[PDB]
Design a binder for this molecule. Structure first.
Ligand SMILES: *CCC(=O)N1CN(C(=O)CC*)CN(C(=O)CC*)C1
Lengths: 12, 115
């Protein structure tokens, strides 16, 4: 899975 | 470039009201919207997202980048989740930052307007 840069992960 | 016409607008509104809104308010740190007479308008939900994208993430003459701010990081995540194809497009001075964030709050109010 690719997490974007400067991108909050809190909707997961 | 990206065309916000296929996004899940209702989910993005729920995300804004649930968690993004409070972060723009925090950023504004007591400065009120009446400090700034010039506003930026928008005309429909995708046009509002287009302008939200531009003011959140594009450098300007007076505000070099808001991309590291919490409200921006949360905006990016919401667009990544609820706008099909948005994430693919993202793989590749501070004197106006408060004005810019105040304008963003107004663009979101129009995005959020009841139908
Ligand atoms: C592994 C990446 C992922 O699950 N997604 C891409 N993405 C972002 O990178 C947000 C910063 C949006 N997604 C989620 O936020 C799930 C929590 C989906």
């Amino acid at each position: 899975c690719h997490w974007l840069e400067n991108c909050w992960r809190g909707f997961c | 470039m990206y065309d916000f016409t296929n996004c899940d607008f209702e989910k993005i509104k729920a995300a804004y009201l649930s968690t993004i809104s409070k972060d723009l308010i925090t950023y504004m740190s007591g400065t009120k919207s009446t400090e700034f007479n010039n506003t930026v308008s928008c005309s429909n939900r995708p046009h509002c997202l287009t302008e939200i994208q531009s003011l959140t993430f594009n450098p300007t003459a007076g505000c070099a980048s808001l991309a590291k701010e919490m409200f921006a990081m949360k905006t990016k995540a919401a667009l990544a989740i609820w706008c099909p194809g948005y994430s693919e497009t993202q793989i590749n001075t501070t004197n106006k930052c408060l004005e810019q964030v105040s304008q963003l709050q107004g663009l979101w109010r129009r995005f959020n307007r009841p139908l």
